[PDB]
């Protein structure tokens, strides 16, 4: 019966906001796109403008090549049949070369070479996007927290696709490009290394993924509960603490016995999120290269009855 | 004992039940009626877990496990050494979580803020109840519920999932995972963006939310906004947990086969069910 | 015309050396293709 | 949208 | 090509040059990888077989 | 395949897990100390420094530079509630509520509390007023939902308290912030959008009764609002939830 | 034939050129790959079998 | 019959032109792919048969 | 009209759109005839 | 009219140079197709 | 009967045209796919059987 | 009668869109059911009559 | 008026809607009749 | 009646041209159906 | 009895009641079709020897 502030009840539109021109080449920035009332019911209605620099276009074209390579392989697997393509869309897979090729690049296209091509494209796209996040932060004079938070996820991705295959000595260890295919790869990876549940770093990574869900629920709910005091304007609460920040702090102080500040809760948030992929990459790197049976390792380290 | 701004908020009122009997603070904690309930439930459960550790014969915290009763006990009680301790710890935990949420409601009322936090925690409690109460009740045994051990509820997850093949193919499981991954991504982005605005490069003026919107419009062409991001985080977490509970409530009660077979309905649509080639055909 | 705000003399002095670089690149590429075809023809 | 929310295409269009 | 100078009247030179560099680099790598994939043209493999290496 | 253990069962996985325990302890210490830049040192209920300050020491000060020449904020710094809190304790010992001495909603305590913020308007990235009335907001209009201009405003006591005459908008975020309500006395008040319930025929305000819209603090300038003023208004309206309960 | 210049009056030249370049490169790559997949036109395999390179 | 031009007073010419270009290219590729997938009309396989290339 | 284009603008736009369309359809029917004499589908 | 902010003279010149490029591209395409067909016909 | 035009007052003509076109194309694709599905009317397989192309 | 009062409450536009979706779904379902029964698949029946398969 | 439509507006809109319904139903009846002539299902 | 701001004359001419288009589309469809039924009737 | 329209909003009740009516009716029709004693099309096909 009361307004929960989940959806805006009255939308307001003014002149298009071009943004802050700190050091941004206004040539690279595109024009403001359309206004989406559907998106405006939940957040901002404005689309664009989007910046397109050197790294932006490099990453966009490299990612387009990766996506197109996978899609053309999928069309080949369908026998160029659109009905088959739609029927088996989730069952298609661009697989890495068989283990007998090792890390060599001399695998046939149908048996792993096209996977290497798509992998190179993806590698370029992701690293150019990382540089792009760093440079976009730099142009506006902001800190580089987004770049390092992205670097954590990039490290999990690199361990999965690049570093662990090299350590294990074959491209066959890497992840195929496919919807159900990479799910099968995940399940098989767990089975081969003996119940990845007993990997300590898989356990910590899950602790932090659960903790990210918990913490974003807590933080979103807290900010919505104090939005009646302008609590969603967190930067001004950092600069000039209002009653929203105090009420949020006191809620969690009286509930848990300790609280955060408007600025430090975001340190909690960023670390809780990055630890997911950081710990996960460590665990995946250890799997196979150091421990090949995590249940037996568990038994030898407590964690499981002998 | 108090924060520098805390005193002007410690006024009486907002209590759901009581009003003076349990309207005070112990240290930083607000002690309501539900405060007393939560403390007793938590202490009873923890010391019962310690007692079960004594019974089991291990002092390894990782090895401590409180299994529910075996399947032949049905939905009935069991000897404390066998399955009853789990049931007492389960009722204690349920009471502790519910009273914790109610204590949060009291704290919200005293502070004059919305009730979003207890609502989200209620989502979490409902998922827990699905795992311990609703699903085992629909399957007619407390033995289906997970044990209370650090590394033995993982064995419960493993066995329960592998009962249905690769559990990845549960579609509500896929949706819940998408929400979980999206939520972690959004949390990283939100923490990073706020910290980068509040901590500019070197001796630079603190940034405004206009800079945050500009950063994300430059990056991906959209900016959900300061209010929209908190709405999105809350909704992503709650939807993740909702679809988790939904995926487990239908497993073993509405679905009994391997989950991968559920996808056959797409590959067997009559227009393309019998076209050779591809993967399934 | 005039989207980037430049002069036709600048366009000339730019496009000429652009074609210079293109022709250098194409000449080296043609030499490489000739050497490969001699070494191991693909037709 | 919640007022017309009591398949989805009816509220969608 | 004496009328093709007008591209620089509509396209910023930096954008054109970076796009050209990106395209050429990606295309070159793709073609070299395709050649390495085909055992008929894997020059390392060809020389390995020619000189009795491993 | 590595897996040689240096001693006992201590392989590379054990090294990694213990290294992570050390790193996590250090990180938790860092996060907790960084979250002590406000509200510390702890105080007794009489405002004197407490004997117990906690296991975590206070961090080194850091200074934020405000974006429009608004100054510099160093935290943690001296803290003083620059307002006369009107409360009296109900017990000699600690950990008990402090009852209001007079009208809590009027005095600004409890759920009606406000914070002595800066008495300047919030400035966007261009140095202009962030929140301004739709009249002064050029090109700003209602895009969706029922436009609440001229809708009667009903209180928690279910009687009309006034009519909305304008919408105050956050310019960069392009979202509604406040409804300006003209009461039966010809004077204007601001109401946060988060505490109004726009409906088909009326704007409902569950927080306040009809005989409370007069008590809402006003803005000295009719075309702008400062952080202090909106803090007072929002605190008043929110405290109406607890302190207008006797009416409804 | 000649009155088609008006399309440049209704469309931004720069975006059209970018889209055209992307479209043509994707089409060329797709066709070359289709020919590679078909053994009848896999010129690398054809040359290999013709010259006994495998 | 000769009064259809008023359709241009309903929709932006750019939107309809981009939508119809996308639709036409997608339809052309769809039909070409349907022809390739049917072995009786796969012109590549048909030429391979008619010229004994396999 | 919604776009705001006047009568003459719509006339010119439609007359050139049809001018393109007829060329497209003529090339299409030439291609169809070539295929049909090559390999009829009826 | 003038959605792109261009003039009929500028649009005419732009279309002329674009069509010149298109015809060169189509000419090279024709040559390549002829070479392929004489190398391997596909009908 | 002759007063149907007033529906254009209630409904937005642009959205009506777009949604109607999408429905028409989906319907036609669905019917052509029914015809392709049935061996009695799959004109490609019919022509192949008539001219003995398999 | 007095049925036109039904337009005084429900939005005409969403009523018409819902009616169109409902009618299309029902017609498609009825035709598909007729196809499913081999005795009413008019393509199959015509094939049997004209000795087509 | 509960949603803004008048008495005459509601009457005319319902008349058009019912006229369309009757046209659709007459066409459907002719379809069922021709089908029953072809092969009765009873 | 509203909901768009249109008029009687604009809506009427829109519907007239739309109905002409529907009649032409139906004529082409019926010609196609007749040709198909002659080629291979389904009745 | 007459007060049901006062507590409950007409739109929700009307739409839900109609939706339930349609789904229950089509379920009944499906159940009748499924069993070989109320599948009218099969009865007609066997009757006219068109099966
Ligand atoms: C590693 C490569 C370095 C990456 C980070 C570089 C950096 O310093 O960023 C500053 C970065 C941006 O600074 P800025 O924008 O230049 O500064 C603006 C202003 O000056 C204002 O800047 P600011 O003051 O906001 O930033 C200060 C921030 C910056 O500090 C950091 O970034 C530290 C990064 C720590 C990386 C930890 C690696 C994981 C180790 C796990 C154990 C292995 C087993 O300080 C902290 O966050 C301290 C965190 C706690 C550190 C100490 C923890 C206890 C140590 C345990 C021993 C003692 C007990 O600050 C942040 O964004 C911090 C949050 C994000 C951290 C992301 C960490 C990513 C890790 C790399 C990805 C994975 C790579 C492979 C790892 C796996 C190998 C096994
Ligand atoms: C049967 C399967 C096994 C299992 C096998 C594995 C394997 C194998 C792995 C995990 C991993 C994880 N497991 Mg596990 N896991 C199991 C059971 C679980 C259960 C459960 C309740 O049962 C949970 C909650 C989890 C949860 C987790 C996560 C904590 C962790 C994934 C972190 C992540 O976010 O990666 C997702 C994020 C990334 C992969 C990085 C993405 C960053 C890149 C750069 C993205 C680029 C986008 C790309 C370019 C495309 C662009 C798109 C367009 C731009 C839109 N697992 C069981 C035991 N699990 C991962 C891990 O961390 O190991 C410890 C992992 O490798
Ligand atoms: C051998 C047996 C007979 C047969 C035995 C029966 C029996 C017995 C019955 C039917 C009935 C029906 N049969 Mg029969 N029927 C047979 C096979 C068929 C076949 C077929 C494919 O062969 C078809 C198409 C039908 C068709 C029908 C329907 C016309 C009718 C059900 C109407 C209905 O449920 O409306 C339900 C939908 C509504 C009422 C509209 C409401 C839903 C809307 C969309 C949602 C609400 C929105 C709205 C705006 C809300 C505001 C207003 C609200 C309505 C309050 N039958 C065979 C041939 N049939 C039933 C009947 O006669 O009922 C009249 C019935 O009892
Ligand atoms: C719904 C979205 C996510 C969410 C939200 C959420 N959680 C919340 C909240 C919210 C909004 C709170 O306000 C509340 C809180 O106070 O947070 C600090 C909380 C909370 N979520 C917590 C944990 C938690 N949340 C989890 C999940 C989630 N929380 C969701 C993913 C998980 C997971 C996935 O594992 C955990 C572990 C607590 C820190 C806290 C609730 C504290 C509480 O209930 O206090 C009273 C109870 C005790 C002090 C302990 C009682 C102990 C029992 C008596 C005995 C043990 C029983 C138990 C079953 C044993 C388990 C054994 C093994 C399975 C390990
Ligand atoms: C990113 C990584 C996130 C990891 C999250 C999971 C791991 C647990 C993290 C616990 C952080 C605790 C931080 C300190 C909190 C604390 O001790 O506060 C005291 C109450 O303690 C308590 O209530 C103890 C905390 C609850 C039990 C934890 C086990 C009150 O004192 P204070 O810390 O406010 O004092 C500060 C100096 N005055
Ligand atoms: C899967 O399919 C495969 C890959 C097998 C086959 C497919 C192949 C395909 C699709 C190939 C496509 C090839 C294309 C489109 C090639 C196009 C190549 C072009 C246009 C290359 C242009 C090159 C230009 C170059 C290299 C210019 C270089 C210039 C310099 C090095 C110096 C330039 C500096 C200048 C001009 C200074 C100018 C600045 C001022 C201010 C005057
Ligand atoms: C499984 O079920 C199967 C498929 C077996 C059987 C089921 C069959 C079913 C459900 C069939 C349903 C068929 C239906 C509903 C067919 C309806 C078709 C209709 C209504 C087609 C209408 C077409 C109308 C057209 C193409 C109109 C075109 C109009 C124009 C091109 C005019 C352009 C507009 C202008 C010029 C605007 C004028 C503006 C001013 C200012 C005058
Ligand atoms: C699965 O199906 C397969 C793929 C097997 C078969 C399907 C095939 C299909 C559907 C093929 C579709 C092919 C199409 C539609 C091809 C269209 C190709 C076109 C339109 C190519 C046009 C190229 C135009 C070019 C190359 C023009 C270049 C012009 C320039 C570079 C001139 C530079 C412009 C300037 C200087 C303008 C500046 C002027 C001023 C006044 C500043
Ligand atoms: C397995 O067994 C099964 C399920 C198949 C048997 C069960 C069958 C069942 C349950 C069947 C249920 C059938 C029902 C409920 C059928 C209802 C059909 C209806 C409501 C049809 C109504 C159609 C209305 C039409 C066609 C009206 C068209 C009107 C126009 C085209 C005029 C357009 C004017 C408008 C929209 C507004 C006028 C306003 C102005 C200003 C002009
Ligand atoms: C109609 O459809 C069209 C054709 C138009 C477009 C359709 C496209 C489609 C259907 C795309 C489908 C895409 C899918 C299913 C993508 C799935 C991707 C997934 C699930 C990826 C999952 C994991 C990938 C990982 C972990 C990749 C890791 C890769 C790296 C870490 C870099 C790898 C780099 C390597 C191995 C070295 C490369 C370097 C050289 C020199 C080869
Ligand atoms: C970014 C990391 C770069 C450094 C990578 C270092 C590893 C270099 C390649 C891995 C070494 C390959 O080692 C070779 O593997 C082949 C199988 O393919 C095997 O051949 C037998 C042997 O194991 C070894 O001769
Ligand atoms: C929690 C953070 C603080 C950790 C302690 C601080 C020091 C950090 C480095 C510690 C590294 C050594 O840590 C120590 O390694 C040895 C290696 O066998 C472990 O192993 C020892 O105990 C286990 C369990 O009873 C036996 O199975 C094993 O045979 C025995 O050697 C110890 O259980 C562990 O305590
Ligand atoms: Fe936040």
Positive or negative CA dihedral for B10, B15, B20, B23? Answer: negative
DSSP per-residue codes, M5-31: --HHHHHHHHHHHHHHHHHHHHHHHHH
F22 token code pair: 């050390």
Domains and CATH numbers, chain L: 4-50 (4.10.220.20)
Calculated CA dihedral for residues B200, B203, B205, B209, nearest 10 degrees: 0
Contact (CB, 8 A) for F43 and B28: no
In sequence order, the 6+-apart residues with CB closer than 8 A to the CB of A250 are A259, B3, B6, B9, B111
- Cα C22 to middle of ligand 6, angstroms: 6
- Cα B120 to middle of ligand 4, angstroms: 11
K12 token code pair: 């937005």
Name the residue among A187, F51, L14 with its Cα closest to residue K15.
Answer: L14
Name the residue among B244, B237, B52 with its Cα closest to residue B161.
Answer: B244
Residues of G in contact with J41 (CB under 8 A): none
Burial of A189 (0-12, 13-18, 19+ CB in 10 A): middle
d(CA A266, CA O29): 58
- Cα O21 to middle of ligand 3, angstroms: 9
CA distance H6 to chain G (A): 18
Q: Could you tell me if B46 and B128 lie in one domain?
A: yes
Name the residue among A97, A112, A94 with its Cα closest to residue A180.
Answer: A94
Report the chain K residue with the minimal C-alpha distance to residue H38: K44
d(CA F80, CA F100): 20
Number of CB pairs < 8 Å for G and I? Answer: 6
d(CA E35, CA E42): 6
Q: Helix or strand or coil: residue D7?
A: coil
Atom 5 of ligand 12, nearest CA residue: F18
Given K11, K23, K38, which is nearest L43 (Cβ)?
A: K38
Report the chain H residue with the minimal C-alpha distance to residue J1: H13
Atom 32 of ligand 8, nearest CA residue: J18
CA distance D10 to chain L (A): 5
CA distances in angstroms from J3 to A49, B196, E51, H5, I17, listed in the order given = 19, 40, 66, 19, 17
CA distance F143 to chain A (A): 5
CA distances in angstroms from F186 to A293, F164, F236, F237, M42, listed in the order given = 79, 12, 20, 20, 78
Alpha helices in chain E (DSSP H): 13-37, 43-50
CA distances in angstroms from O42 to C12, L46, M31, listed in the order given = 82, 19, 21
Q: Helix or strand or coil: residue F90?
A: coil
CA distances in angstroms from E16 to A19, A53, A54, G12, listed in the order given = 26, 11, 10, 17
What is the longest distance spanned by two Cα atoms in chain B? 76
Architecture of domain F104-244: Alpha-Beta Complex (3.90)
**CB-side exposure of F153: number of CA atoms within 13 Å?**
31
Q: Could you tell me if B10 and B121 lie in one domain?
A: yes
Site of tokens 């429009």: F68
Helix axes A113-139, B209-220, angle to 10 degrees: 160
Checking I16-22 for CB contacts under 8 A at 24+ apart, the result is: I16/G3, I16/G4, I16/G6, I19/G3, I20/G4
Given N3, N40, N42, which is nearest L42 (Cβ)?
A: N42
Which of B163, B198, B225 terminates a domain? The answer is B163
Name the residue among B22, B24, B26, B29 with its Cα closest to residue B11.
Answer: B24
Q: Could you tell me if B55 and B186 lie in one domain?
A: no
Q: Helix or strand or coil: residue H39?
A: coil
Contact (CB, 8 A) for A181 and A95: yes
- Cα F27 to middle of ligand 1, angstroms: 10
Alpha helices in chain J (DSSP H): 8-39
Residues of H in contact with I3 (CB under 8 A): 8-13
d(CA M17, CA B241): 46
d(CA B140, CA B73): 10
- Give the helix, strand, coil percentages of chain G, each rounded to 5: 80, 0, 20
CA distance N4 to chain K (A): 6
β-strands F203-204, F98-100: how paired?
Answer: unpaired
Domain of residue B206 covers: 164-263
d(CA O25, CA O14): 16
d(CA H30, CA H36): 10
CB pair distance less than 8 Å for D4 and O16: no
Report the chain K residue with the minimal C-alpha distance to residue B273: K37
In sequence order, the 6+-apart residues with CB closer than 8 A to the CB of L8 are M1, M2, M3, M5, M10
Rg (CA), chain C: 17
Q: Could you tell me if B111 and B32 lie in one domain?
A: yes
E18 token code pair: 């970076």
Site of tokens 């706020």: B194
Geometric angle at alpha carbon K11, from L26 and J1, rounded to 5°: 125
Which of B112, B135, B163 terminates a domain? The answer is B163
**CB-side exposure of H34: number of CA atoms within 13 Å?**
15
Report the chain K residue with the minimal C-alpha distance to residue L12: K10
Query: What's this structure's resolution in Å?
Result: 2.8
DSSP per-residue codes, O11-51: HHHHHHHHHHHHHHHHHHHHHHHHSTTS-HHHHHHHHHT--
Name the residue among I10, E38, B194, B226 with its Cα closest to residue A114.
Answer: E38
d(CA A114, CA A131): 26
Burial of O37 (0-12, 13-18, 19+ CB in 10 A): exposed
Residue B220 lies inside a defined structural domain of this protein: yes
Contact (CB, 8 A) for F217 and F229: yes
Contact (CB, 8 A) for A284 and A156: yes
d(CA E41, CA E51): 16
Contact (CB, 8 A) for A94 and A118: yes
d(CA K19, CA K31): 18
B281 token code pair: 């055909």
In three-state form (DSSP H/G/I as H, E/B as E, the rest C), the secondary structure along K1-54 is: CCCHHHHHHHCCHHHHHHHHHHHHHHHHHHHHHHHHHCCCCCHHHHHHHHHCCC
Cβ neighbour number for residue H49 with a 10 Å cutoff: 14
DSSP state at residue F59: P
The CB of A71 under 6 Å from ligand 10? The reply is: yes
β-strands B29-31, B24-26: how paired?
Answer: antiparallel
Q: Where are any strands of DSSP class E within chain A?
A: 11-13
CA distances in angstroms from A174 to A101, A124, B103, M10, listed in the order given = 13, 17, 49, 66
CB pair distance less than 8 Å for B1 and F65: no
Instruction: List chain O gaps (C–N > 2.5 A) by preceding residue.
Output: none
Ligand 6: which atom is nearest the Cα of residue C25? Answer: 26
CA distances in angstroms from I39 to B79, I32, I36, N33, listed in the order given = 83, 10, 5, 23
Could you give phi then psi for residue F203, rounded to 5 degrees? Answer: -100, 115
Q: Could you tell me if B11 and B123 lie in one domain?
A: yes
Geometric angle at alpha carbon E22, from E21 and E24, rounded to 5°: 65
F142 - beta bridge partners? A12
Q: Helix or strand or coil: residue F43?
A: strand
Contact (CB, 8 A) for B98 and B172: no
What is the longest distance spanned by two Cα atoms in chain C? 49
In sequence order, the 6+-apart residues with CB closer than 8 A to the CB of F92 are none
Given D3, D4, D6, which is nearest O16 (Cβ)?
A: D6
G21 token code pair: 């370049």
- Cα E2 to middle of ligand 8, angstroms: 20
Contact (CB, 8 A) for B117 and A250: no
**CB-side exposure of B61: number of CA atoms within 13 Å?**
1
F189 - beta bridge partners? F181
Atom 15 of ligand 6, nearest CA residue: G25
The CB of G29 under 6 Å from ligand 6? The reply is: yes
Number of domains in chain B: 2
Residue B80 lies inside a defined structural domain of this protein: yes
Q: Could you tell me if B122 and B4 lie in one domain?
A: yes
DSSP state at residue N14: H
Q: Could you tell me if B154 and B241 lie in one domain?
A: no
DSSP per-residue codes, B194-248: HHHHHS-SSSPPPPPHHHHHHHHHHHHSB---HHHHHHHHHHHHHHHHHHHHHHH
d(CA A243, CA F115): 5
Q: Could you tell me if B110 and B175 lie in one domain?
A: no
Name the residue among B207, B212, B241 with its Cα closest to residue B226.
Answer: B212
Q: Could you tell me if B127 and B17 lie in one domain?
A: yes
> Distance of alpha carbon A189 from its chain centroid, rounded?
21
Q: Helix or strand or coil: residue F199?
A: coil
Please report, in angstroms and rounded to a whole number, the separation of the first and last CA atoms in chain B. 71
Site of tokens 């040709």: N35
Q: Helix or strand or coil: residue C4?
A: coil
CA distances in angstroms from F175 to A41, B232, K21, listed in the order given = 11, 17, 36
What is the longest distance spanned by two Cα atoms in chain K? 57
Q: Could you tell me if B135 and B174 lie in one domain?
A: no
A272-290: string of b/e by CB count within 10 Å (b at 16+)?
A: bbbbbbbbbbbbbbbbbbb
d(CA G25, CA G31): 10
d(CA A67, CA N22): 41
d(CA I26, CA F197): 62
Residues in chain C: 43
d(CA I21, CA F33): 71
d(CA J26, CA F172): 50
* Omega before B79 within 30 of 0, i.e. cis: no
Q: Could you tell me if B173 and B258 lie in one domain?
A: yes
F168 token code pair: 């105050």
Helix axes B85-111, B33-56, angle to 10 degrees: 150
Phi-psi region of A44 (alpha: psi -120 to 50; beta: other; left: phi over 0): beta
Positive or negative CA dihedral for A201, A204, A208, A210? Answer: positive
F167 - beta bridge partners? F179
d(CA A52, CA A56): 5
Q: Helix or strand or coil: residue I17?
A: helix
Geometric angle at alpha carbon C30, from C29 and C32, rounded to 5°: 65
> Distance of alpha carbon F125 from its chain centroid, rounded?
21
Number of CB pairs < 8 Å for C and G? Answer: 10
Please report, in angstroms and rounded to a whole number, the separation of the first and last CA atoms in chain D. 11
Site of tokens 């003995």: K52
Q: Which of K38, K42, K45, K49 to mutate to test the interface with L (most CBs of L within 10 A)?
A: K38
d(CA B100, CA B38): 6
Residue B281 lies inside a defined structural domain of this protein: no
Q: Which of K15, K17, K42, K47 to mutate to test the interface with I (most CBs of I within 10 A)?
A: K47
Method: cryo-EM
d(CA J36, CA G46): 13
Contact (CB, 8 A) for B214 and A33: no
Rg (CA), chain G: 19
DSSP state at residue A291: B
Burial of C24 (0-12, 13-18, 19+ CB in 10 A): exposed
Residues of G in contact with C3 (CB under 8 A): 13-14
CA distances in angstroms from I30 to I33, I36, I37, K17, listed in the order given = 5, 10, 11, 31
Domains and CATH numbers, chain C: 1-43 (1.20.5.250)
Residues of J in contact with G6 (CB under 8 A): 11
Q: Which helix (H) or strand (E) holds F177?
A: strand F175-183
Q: CATH code at B80?
A: 1.20.85.10
Contact (CB, 8 A) for B79 and B85: no
Query: Which ligand has the shortest distance to the CA of A169?
Result: 11
DSSP state at residue I2: -
d(CA B85, CA B65): 11
d(CA F80, CA F90): 23
d(CA D2, CA C24): 66
Residues in chain M: 42
Q: Could you tell me if B158 and B201 lie in one domain?
A: no
CA distance H12 to chain J (A): 11
Q: Helix or strand or coil: residue A301?
A: coil
Contact (CB, 8 A) for B95 and A192: no
**CB-side exposure of A246: number of CA atoms within 13 Å?**
30
Pocket test for ligand 4, best of B121, B142, B181 (most atoms within 8 A of CB): B121
DSSP per-residue codes, L10-50: S-HHHHHHHHHHHHHHHHHHHHHHHHHSTTS-HHHHHHHHH
d(CA A61, CA A55): 10
F78 token code pair: 């001296």
d(CA A62, CA N42): 52
């Amino acid at each position: 019966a009361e307004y929960q502030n989940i959806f805006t009840q009255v939308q307001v539109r003014g002149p298009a906001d071009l943004g802050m021109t700190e050091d941004v080449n206004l040539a690279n920035r595109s024009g403001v796109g359309p206004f989406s009332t559907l998106l405006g019911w939940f957040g901002n209605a404005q689309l664009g403008p989007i910046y397109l620099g050197s790294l932006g276009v490099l990453s966009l074209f490299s990612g387009l090549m990766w996506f197109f390579t996978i899609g053309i392989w999928f069309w080949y697997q369908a026998g160029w049949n659109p009905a088959v393509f739609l029927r088996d869309l989730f069952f298609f897979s661009l697989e890495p070369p068989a283990p007998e090729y090792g890390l060599s690049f001399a695998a046939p296209l149908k048996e792993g070479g096209l996977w290497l091509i798509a992998s190179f494209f993806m590698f370029v796209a992701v690293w150019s996007w990382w540089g792009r996040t760093y440079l976009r932060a730099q142009a506006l004079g902001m800190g580089k927290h987004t770049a390092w938070a992205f670097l954590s996820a990039i490290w999990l991705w690199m361990v999965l696709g690049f570093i662990r295959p090299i350590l294990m000595g074959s491209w066959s260890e890497a992840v195929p490009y496919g919807i159900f295919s990479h799910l099968d790869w995940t399940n098989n990876f767990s089975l081969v290394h003996g119940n990845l549940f007993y990997n300590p770093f898989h356990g910590l990574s899950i602790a932090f993924l659960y903790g990210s869900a918990l913490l974003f629920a807590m933080h979103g709910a807290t900010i919505l509960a104090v939005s009646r005091f302008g609590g969603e304007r967190e930067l001004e609460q950092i600069a000039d603490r209002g009653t929203a920040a105090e009420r949020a702090a006191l809620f969690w102080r009286w509930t848990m016995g300790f609280n955060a500040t408007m600025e430090g809760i975001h340190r909690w948030a960023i670390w809780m999120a990055v630890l997911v992929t950081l710990t996960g990459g460590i665990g995946i790197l250890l799997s196979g290269t150091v421990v090949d049976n995590w249940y037996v390792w568990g038994q030898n380290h407590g964690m499981a009855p002998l | 004992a108090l924060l520098s701004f805390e005193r002007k908020y410690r006024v009486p009122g907002g209590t759901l039940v009581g009003g003076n009997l349990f309207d005070f603070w112990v240290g930083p904690f607000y002690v309501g009626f539900f405060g007393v309930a939560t403390f007793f439930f938590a202490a009873l459960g923890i010391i019962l877990i310690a007692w079960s550790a004594v019974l089991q014969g291990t002092w390894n915290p990782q090895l401590i496990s409180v299994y529910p009763p075996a399947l032949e006990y049905g939905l009935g009680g069991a000897p404390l050494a066998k399955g009853g301790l789990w049931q007492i710890i389960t009722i204690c935990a349920t009471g502790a979580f519910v009273s914790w949420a109610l204590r949060e409601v009291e704290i919200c009322r005293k502070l004059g803020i919305g009730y979003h936090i207890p609502f989200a925690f209620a989502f979490a409690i409902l998922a827990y109840l699905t795992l311990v109460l609703f699903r085992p009740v629909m399957m007619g045994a407390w033995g289906y519920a997970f044990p209370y051990g650090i590394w033995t509820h993982l064995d419960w997850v493993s066995n329960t999932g592998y009962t249905y093949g690769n559990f990845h193919y549960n579609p509500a499981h896929m949706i819940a995972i998408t929400f979980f991954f999206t939520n972690a991504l959004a949390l990283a982005l939100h923490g990073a963006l706020v910290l980068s605005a509040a901590n500019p490069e070197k001796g630079k003026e603190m940034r405004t939310p206009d800079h945050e919107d500009t950063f994300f419009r430059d990056l991906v062409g959209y900016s959900i906004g300061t209010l929209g991001i908190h709405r999105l985080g809350l909704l992503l977490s709650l939807s993740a947990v909702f679809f988790s509970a939904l995926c487990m409530i239908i497993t073993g009660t509405i679905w009994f086969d391997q989950w991968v077979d559920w996808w056959q309905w797409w590959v067997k649509l009559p227009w393309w069910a019998n076209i050779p080639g591809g993967i399934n055909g | 015309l005039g989207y980037t705000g430049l002069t036709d003399e600048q366009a000339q002095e730019l496009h000429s050396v652009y074609m210079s670089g293109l022709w250098l690149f194409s000449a080296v590429a043609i030499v490489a293709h000739l050497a490969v075809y001699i070494w191991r023809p693909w037709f | 949208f919640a007022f017309r929310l009591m398949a989805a295409f009816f509220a969608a269009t | 090509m004496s009328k093709f100078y007008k591209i620089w009247m509509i396209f910023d030179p930096r954008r054109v040059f970076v796009a050209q560099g990106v395209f050429l680099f990606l295309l070159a790598v793709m073609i070299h990888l395709i050649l390495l994939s085909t055992p008929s043209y894997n020059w390392l493999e060809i020389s390995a077989a020619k000189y009795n290496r491993v | 395949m590595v897996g040689v253990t240096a001693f006992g069962n201590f392989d590379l996985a054990s090294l990694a897990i213990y290294s992570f325990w050390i790193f996590l302890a250090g990180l938790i210490y860092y996060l907790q100390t960084e979250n002590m830049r406000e509200g510390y040192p702890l105080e007794n209920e009489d405002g004197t420094p407490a004997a117990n300050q906690g296991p975590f020491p206070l961090p080194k000060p850091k200074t934020f530079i405000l974006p429009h020449g608004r100054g510099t904020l160093t935290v943690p710094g001296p803290e003083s509630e620059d307002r006369p809190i009107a409360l009296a304790r109900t017990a000699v010992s600690e950990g008990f509520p402090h009852a209001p001495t007079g009208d809590p909603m009027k005095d600004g305590v409890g759920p009606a509390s406000w914070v002595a913020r800066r008495d300047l308007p919030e400035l966007d990235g261009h140095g202009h007023n962030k929140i301004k009335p739709m009249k002064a907001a050029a090109g700003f209009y209602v895009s969706a939902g029922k436009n609440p201009i001229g809708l009667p405003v009903r209180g928690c006591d279910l009687e009309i308290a006034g009519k909305v005459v304008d919408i105050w908008v956050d310019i960069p975020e392009q979202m509604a912030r406040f409804l300006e309500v003209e009461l039966k006395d010809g004077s204007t008040r601001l109401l946060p959008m988060q505490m109004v319930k726009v409906q088909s025929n009326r704007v409902h305000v569950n927080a306040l009764s009809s005989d409370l819209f007069a008590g809402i603090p006003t803005i000295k300038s009719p075309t702008e609002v400062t952080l202090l003023e909106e803090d007072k208004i929002c605190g008043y309206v929110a405290g109406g939830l607890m302190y207008a309960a006797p009416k409804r």
